[PDB]
Design an enzyme around this catalytic site. Structure first.
Site, PDB file in Angstrom:
ATOM      1  N   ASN A  44       0.853  -1.196   0.000  1.00  0.00           N
ATOM      2  CA  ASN A  44       0.000   0.000   0.000  1.00  0.00           C
ATOM      3  C   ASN A  44       0.893   1.252   0.000  1.00  0.00           C
ATOM      4  O   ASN A  44       1.576   1.519   0.993  1.00  0.00           O
ATOM      5  CB  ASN A  44      -0.909   0.000   1.238  1.00  0.00           C
ATOM      6  CG  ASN A  44      -1.884   1.171   1.207  1.00  0.00           C
ATOM      7  OD1 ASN A  44      -2.978   1.031   0.702  1.00  0.00           O
ATOM      8  ND2 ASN A  44      -1.463   2.340   1.699  1.00  0.00           N
ATOM      9  N   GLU A  45       0.894   1.996  -1.114  1.00  0.00           N
ATOM     10  CA  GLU A  45       1.693   3.199  -1.282  1.00  0.00           C
ATOM     11  C   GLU A  45       3.136   2.944  -0.845  1.00  0.00           C
ATOM     12  O   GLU A  45       3.707   3.717  -0.060  1.00  0.00           O
ATOM     13  CB  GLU A  45       1.111   4.389  -0.501  1.00  0.00           C
ATOM     14  CG  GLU A  45      -0.306   4.831  -0.901  1.00  0.00           C
ATOM     15  CD  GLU A  45      -0.617   6.221  -0.365  1.00  0.00           C
ATOM     16  OE1 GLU A  45      -0.215   6.543   0.762  1.00  0.00           O
ATOM     17  OE2 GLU A  45      -1.285   7.010  -1.052  1.00  0.00           O
ATOM     18  N   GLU A  68      -7.972   5.498  -4.662  1.00  0.00           N
ATOM     19  CA  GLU A  68      -8.556   6.161  -3.482  1.00  0.00           C
ATOM     20  C   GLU A  68      -8.903   7.613  -3.827  1.00  0.00           C
ATOM     21  O   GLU A  68      -8.082   8.511  -3.721  1.00  0.00           O
ATOM     22  CB  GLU A  68      -7.603   6.133  -2.280  1.00  0.00           C
ATOM     23  CG  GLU A  68      -6.972   4.793  -1.938  1.00  0.00           C
ATOM     24  CD  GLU A  68      -6.046   4.897  -0.745  1.00  0.00           C
ATOM     25  OE1 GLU A  68      -5.912   6.008  -0.183  1.00  0.00           O
ATOM     26  OE2 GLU A  68      -5.462   3.862  -0.373  1.00  0.00           O
TER      27      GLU A  68
HETATM   28  O1  LIG Z   1      -6.948   8.649   4.631  1.00  0.00           O
HETATM   29  C1  LIG Z   1      -5.659   8.919   4.067  1.00  0.00           C
HETATM   30  C2  LIG Z   1      -5.194   7.719   3.258  1.00  0.00           C
HETATM   31  N1  LIG Z   1      -3.881   7.889   2.612  1.00  0.00           N
HETATM   32  C3  LIG Z   1      -3.541   6.814   1.637  1.00  0.00           C
HETATM   33  C4  LIG Z   1      -3.517   5.419   2.295  1.00  0.00           C
HETATM   34  O2  LIG Z   1      -3.306   4.443   1.289  1.00  0.00           O
HETATM   35  C5  LIG Z   1      -4.846   5.191   3.016  1.00  0.00           C
HETATM   36  O3  LIG Z   1      -4.753   3.952   3.783  1.00  0.00           O
HETATM   37  C6  LIG Z   1      -4.916   6.371   3.898  1.00  0.00           C
HETATM   38  O4  LIG Z   1      -4.173   6.372   5.091  1.00  0.00           O
END
Ligand SMILES: OC[C@H]1NC[C@H](O)[C@@H](O)[C@H]1O
Ligand SMILES: *[C@@H]1O[C@H](CO)[C@@H](O)[C@H](O)[C@H]1NC(C)=O
Ligand SMILES: *[C@@H]1O[C@H](CO)[C@@H](O)[C@H](O)[C@H]1NC(C)=O
Ligand SMILES: *[C@@H]1O[C@H](CO)[C@@H](O)[C@H](O)[C@H]1NC(C)=O
Ligand SMILES: *[C@@H]1O[C@H](CO)[C@@H](O)[C@H](O)[C@H]1NC(C)=O
Ligand SMILES: *[C@@H]1O[C@H](CO)[C@@H](O)[C@H](O)[C@H]1NC(C)=O
Ligand SMILES: *[C@@H]1O[C@H](CO)[C@@H](O)[C@H](O)[C@H]1NC(C)=O
Ligand SMILES: *[C@@H]1O[C@H](CO)[C@@H](O)[C@H](O)[C@H]1NC(C)=O
Ligand SMILES: *[C@@H]1O[C@H](CO)[C@@H](O)[C@H](O)[C@H]1NC(C)=O
Ligand SMILES: OC[C@H]1NC[C@H](O)[C@@H](O)[C@H]1O
Ligand SMILES: [Cl-]
Ligand SMILES: [Cl-]
Lengths: 602, 605
Positions: free
Chosen positions: A159-160, A240
């Site tokens: 994740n990122e 997202e």
């Molecule tokens: O709500 C902000 C958001 N930023 C990006 C992350 O991938 C999410 O899990 C999260 O923390």
């Protein structure tokens, strides 16, 4: 028979050989009681979403090595079958790190038993733990893949990762290999990063489809251009698309205007992009599940997010606005939408002091304290969440105020200090590293330390908690510790075995709800006027943390299914700083249930 | 051991030797589904009431002689136990006549099998039937008497007998004897009449404690003086202090101002008087249970009454105002009050015509018709409620319109007329006794006759129903009738036999389905059904008869739908029997529909 693929020719997904584009919403099953899963998912379906996206928090399912929770509220497989039943596809994000304003980004605190662990890297011990976890989680997810008759159409790896300092490509390649071993060669694997080359540099990998995230403030053309540098061909994807934002205690409640979300959503959809709305319902960080950012600032109990479905699942004007946008592209389901839940103000409930933490150590720590020459962390005493008591004796006379200090800023994250049962005040990570104390030579010095949530993002996710470095009194290092891990959840379940500041203490009261009333119990919101900071349980269920002293959240959401009518409901409060209960008015030592939330107090 | 008595010395009641006065409200268990009994009763307790008052409608419990209904929604014993469990006392009003804007004042229609019966008198056949009923009902009430450990503190004998013409004191003595026989010599027995000597003259009896009723438009001093003339000593009592009033179809919805009810209540209580608020919740006249007044005017389906609790049980401003006044005299229970139920707008549901009444005769009348030279009444064909089809043949060519008449005004109460499947219009008690019809000689003449509700007050409670006198065509008496009593409730529950047995349109049944999702904690919810474009008829959901609709007259447009009759996953079936005109002819299927809304409309223009 069943196929789901990226077609690089129509810059598209193909579902059973047909053009397909997803319009998805985030819902975290760990943030919504299972009692309400079908309500929230059906509200999502009625909005015109054809998919939902969700995180699997590892620490929610593996609290200790080889000890698993997959039942009831932890039943992710059921949650996915329910989505499928409702005609929703699923975008699965199993991590192993998820970020998500969630305790340590979903990573189990027991990883920190190796103090030098490099989380999110090819650290062999980190990899071995991840591999074991994937060996349990992924065979569960395999039958739920679209190709095998389930709802899961794509799966995010990590994740990122591009936001993390490590930039360990071998780590990403390991996950790719392990995901492929368990899930097969057809499942679409992808990665999500910020929509900029600086984020994509370390986050994108060959063989994983590169997607971006961005909110209403971003230039949408530029954002997708950044994705296109990584993936010249295939679907445009915003994994997202921010419908709101996160909060921190002490900071104004975050909101994002409906017009902005609707405008950007329409723009994204019109481009033919697949998109996921983060969050669609945010829900709640019950118990100790909230996370934190660096420099240390914890997110609150509410994860309302200013999302289109409110914390308690209510239909908002944002919900109807986004539904109307979706309706411009796709036919949405017919019929009336399940309603916002009715809310009921149970009103004032008086509490009485049960015991101070200090007087309750037999019940909170039935195994006895651990002795140590120097302080030990939460991890070392085998406690991950909640509170640990640190005890020593005063080495000198403190008739005049003497500085109690954590020179290296090692109170993680907050300590409630007492001397011979006299409260002295509070030490705070990054804010107050010194407190003047008084007491006799040999007086008992107590520090009740709270883990306020492990940091979930940035370099400092290896967040041990406790007294992580030495305390000094009058410049001298304090030695000879008696450390009490505190079994708060058991102790509250047993009514503590009895089956300006105040000492940390538990307060308890009862309220009844009539049986045979078709619309009671109802959802409610608990408020704590006159209280300061603490933890609250109803019928032994830990609803989270209150902090009306700091805001912006004043009320906590109480779902109706934990309330009963067959016996009285109990409310237990652990108040940490100051309780409105030393007065001669018993009506002041009280909580109130109201029918509207207050999450955006100034 | 437990005692309840009138203290004549001190103008008081004594409960277990302690002074007592009651603050009561009327709730009719026959007008609230049992699913909601505890809900209404608890709201009533939370208002500060220490007793409730109820009527026992005889016809509700004995639909035929020797056949009894005491279970589920008919369970009076349970209702009274529930009230007791909530710490409420009960003032019981078992009749045998109750008035109450209820069908025939609670009296069973089969009493009329004796055509010449004089109801509410010493008529031997009336008394015989009353005696048999009391010998079933009163032994069930005996253990619920306060002194036997139950909630029942006083029992009314008859109901405003002083308003009735007969003035038969033998009848009142007979009731008194029989109530004492079954209930014992300690029970407080009382009467209620209008607060005037002209009413009290024939209503009061030696041995039965005389109480009065009056609303906000009465002088309290005068009213209680009229009681005191009859009862110089003992408690002052208003047995029906009106919180609102009844409705009739075609008249504006009755209301009474909150401030007026509040002020009068304060003044009654300040006198030390015991008082019952009629109605506290009114509820609903489901199926055919409504009454009517004379000259013939039927009360509607809603019995909202403008009561402090609305028809669906809602907390109104009136409720809180009355609680506030009670608080000035007594301590009222602590804790939050159960709320108004959530209401949900399920939206528009399309219907489609299933079958005309004429086409469904085999299912409605499976035992076949009764033949007769002249018409027979409902009572004669052993039907009490609903609809009966009267059929004959035209004895003459009526190519030119020929007058069909009831010369003695004997269509009781409405007839939907058809000749060879062509609707001709409506004959109506009082208003229209002649209708011009056309058809060939030998054409089938049908009149579907509706019983709109037996008069519940006045001399004319002996209200037979049907064609109660001859019909004439061109002044000549029509003979040779084939009469079909119609089992509408059975037929609706079997989907007109489709589920087996385990300007005007023809009267017809229209059906449609809708689904409610399962696994949603807050569905189903209560709702209100509305009939835009429809005219006059009857409505069922899942076989439960919700009552009569008549948006053509008002003031009631919506009907209350309680949530417990609705089901999840399985389709809910709505059946509409439309009597006059359905919005279902055109190529717009969307018009043939009903709509569920989340707010009642019972007070429209
Ligand atoms: O709500 C902000 C958001 N930023 C990006 C992350 O991938 C999410 O899990 C999260 O923390
Ligand atoms: C976004 O950036 C592009 C250039 O990449 C520019 O043409 C456009 O004006 C920008 N859009 C908005 C809404 O600012
Ligand atoms: C504590 O007291 C000392 C001496 O009075 C003073 O110099 C110092 O500022 C105080 N420190 C704190 C942290 O309150
Ligand atoms: C505390 O101080 C001692 C002595 O300086 C040192 O050995 C140790 O590393 C310190 N411990 C912690 C937890 O900071
Ligand atoms: C509250 O209820 C608990 C159990 O639900 C019971 O054991 C206890 O006696 C009650 N205590 C108070 C103070 O009301
Ligand atoms: C009611 O009647 C009495 C006499 O019986 C009289 O004193 C009083 O003025 C009247 N009350 C009102 C409000 O008119
Ligand atoms: C019946 O028809 C006659 C014409 O023969 C007309 O005089 C009369 O008014 C009509 N009656 C009704 C009730 O419409
Ligand atoms: C109808 O008319 C006949 C002949 O006059 C009469 O004997 C009979 O009683 C009447 N019947 C009714 C029901 O009015
Ligand atoms: C309504 O539902 C019932 C039960 O499924 C069924 O018998 C009937 O045929 C249905 N009518 C329609 C139009 O679906
Ligand atoms: O609502 C009016 C009221 N009138 C007086 C009667 O006693 C009650 O049954 C009733 O009909
Ligand atoms: Cl997500
Ligand atoms: Cl009553």
């Amino acid at each position: 028979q069943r196929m789901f693929e990226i077609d690089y020719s129509r810059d598209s997904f193909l579902k059973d050989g047909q053009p397909f584009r997803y319009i998805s919403g985030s819902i975290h099953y760990s943030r919504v009681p299972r009692f309400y899963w079908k309500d929230r998912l059906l509200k999502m379906k009625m909005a015109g979403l054809n998919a939902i996206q969700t995180y699997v928090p590892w620490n929610f399912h593996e609290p200790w090595p080889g000890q698993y929770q997959f039942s009831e509220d932890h039943d992710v497989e059921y949650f996915l079958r329910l989505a499928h039943e409702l005609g929703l596809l699923v975008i699965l994000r199993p991590g192993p790190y998820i970020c998500a304003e969630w305790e340590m980004g979903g990573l189990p605190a027991w990883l920190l038993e190796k103090e030098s662990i490099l989380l999110r890297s090819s650290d062999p011990d980190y990899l071995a733990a991840v591999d074991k976890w994937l060996g349990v989680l992924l065979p569960k997810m395999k039958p739920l893949l679209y190709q095998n008759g389930g709802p899961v159409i794509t799966v995010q790896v990590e994740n990122e990762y591009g936001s993390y300092f490590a930039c360990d490509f071998d780590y990403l390649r390991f996950l790719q290999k392990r995901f492929r071993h368990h899930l097969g060669d057809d499942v679409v694997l992808f990665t999500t990063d910020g929509a900029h080359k600086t984020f994509l540099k370390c986050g994108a990998l060959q063989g994983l489809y590169t997607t971006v995230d961005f909110g209403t403030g971003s230039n949408i053309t530029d954002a997708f251009l950044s994705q296109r540098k990584c993936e010249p061909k295939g679907p445009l994807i915003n994994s997202e698309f921010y419908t709101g934002w996160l909060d921190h205690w002490g900071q104004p409640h975050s909101t994002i205007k409906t017009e902005a979300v609707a405008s950007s959503l329409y723009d994204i959809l019109a481009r033919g992009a697949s998109v996921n709305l983060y969050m669609f319902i945010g829900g709640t960080n019950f118990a100790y599940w909230n996370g934190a950012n660096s420099p240390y600032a914890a997110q609150p109990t509410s994860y309302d997010y200013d999302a289109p479905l409110s914390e308690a699942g209510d239909l908002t004007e944002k919900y109807f606005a986004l539904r109307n946008i979706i309706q411009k592209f796709e036919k949405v389901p017919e019929g009336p939408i399940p309603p916002s839940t009715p809310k009921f103000a149970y009103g004032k409930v008086t509490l009485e002091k049960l015991k101070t933490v200090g007087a309750a150590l037999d019940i909170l720590c039935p195994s006895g304290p651990i002795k140590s020459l120097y302080p030990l962390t939460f991890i070392q005493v085998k406690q991950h969440y909640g509170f640990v008591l640190y005890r020593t004796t005063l080495p000198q006379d403190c008739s005049n105020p003497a500085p109690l200090s954590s020179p290296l800023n090692g109170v993680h994250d907050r300590a409630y200090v007492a001397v011979d049962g006299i409260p002295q005040g509070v030490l705070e990570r990054n804010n107050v590293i010194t407190l003047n104390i008084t007491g006799k030579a040999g007086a008992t010095l107590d520090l009740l330390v709270e883990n306020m949530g492990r940091v979930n993002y940035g370099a400092y996710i290896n967040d041990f908690k406790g007294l992580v470095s030495n305390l000094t009194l009058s410049s001298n290092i304090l030695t000879d510790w008696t450390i009490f891990p505190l079994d708060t959840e058991d102790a509250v379940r047993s009514h503590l075995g009895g089956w300006n500041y105040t000492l940390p203490a538990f307060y308890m009261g009862n309220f009844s709800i009539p049986s045979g009333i078709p619309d009671l119990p109802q959802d409610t919101f608990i408020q704590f006027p006159g209280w300061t900071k603490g933890q609250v349980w109803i019928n032994g269920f830990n609803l989270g943390r209150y902090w009306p002293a700091r805001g912006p959240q004043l009320t906590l959401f109480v779902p109706q299914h934990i309330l009963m009518t067959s016996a009285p409901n109990t409310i237990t409060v652990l108040e940490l700083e100051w309780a409105p209960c030393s007065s001669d008015d018993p009506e002041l030592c009280a909580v109130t249930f109201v029918d509207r939330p207050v999450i955006g107090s100034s």
